[PDB]
Design a protein around this ligand. Sequence first.
Ligand SMILES: O=C(O)c1ccc2c(c1)N(CC1CCC1)C[C@@]1(CCCc3cc(Cl)ccc31)CO2
Length: 151
Amino acid sequence: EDELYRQSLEIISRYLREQATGAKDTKPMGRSGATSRKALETLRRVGDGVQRNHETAFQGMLRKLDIKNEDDVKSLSRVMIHVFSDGVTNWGRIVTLISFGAFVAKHLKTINQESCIEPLAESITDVLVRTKRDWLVKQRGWDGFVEFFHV
Ligand SMILES: O=C(O)c1ccc2c(c1)N(CC1CCC1)C[C@@]1(CCCc3cc(Cl)ccc31)CO2
């Protein structure tokens, strides 16, 4: 089974859901739990910082995207491919990708479209894993992510 995909989705989905609801998911992690847990703490530390350091730009992009419903949520995939995939890859850009995703997740809860959060996480995961697998594998996937941002 695609273990990198399954782990990426669990990490991305949990962070987005946690950001939108303000509550942690106490369910156990699936495979590679130890790493996923550390990846999630890393995201809470760096991801949260990103949303604040670039709050104005994030607010601006969100406005441009004008997300009001599911169709708008589905249009985000083309934009992620355009902006994220078509560029040099580094952990910072992957953190921005996921961090803005969490920014969007919070928005979805403000407009009572919370059911779109998991489909959004799936879309982010597709872009990340399906267009940057080689890079991710070379950088040791999530173990590498945790090591890169190690305190
Ligand atoms: O600058 C970078 O290194 C960079 C790297 C990645 C990245 C972005 C910028 N952007 C653009 C920025 C401007 C403020 C947010 C958000 C992005 C595009 C817009 C749709 C979208 C939708 C979702 Cl759910 C998540 C990410 C994205 C694509 O992920």
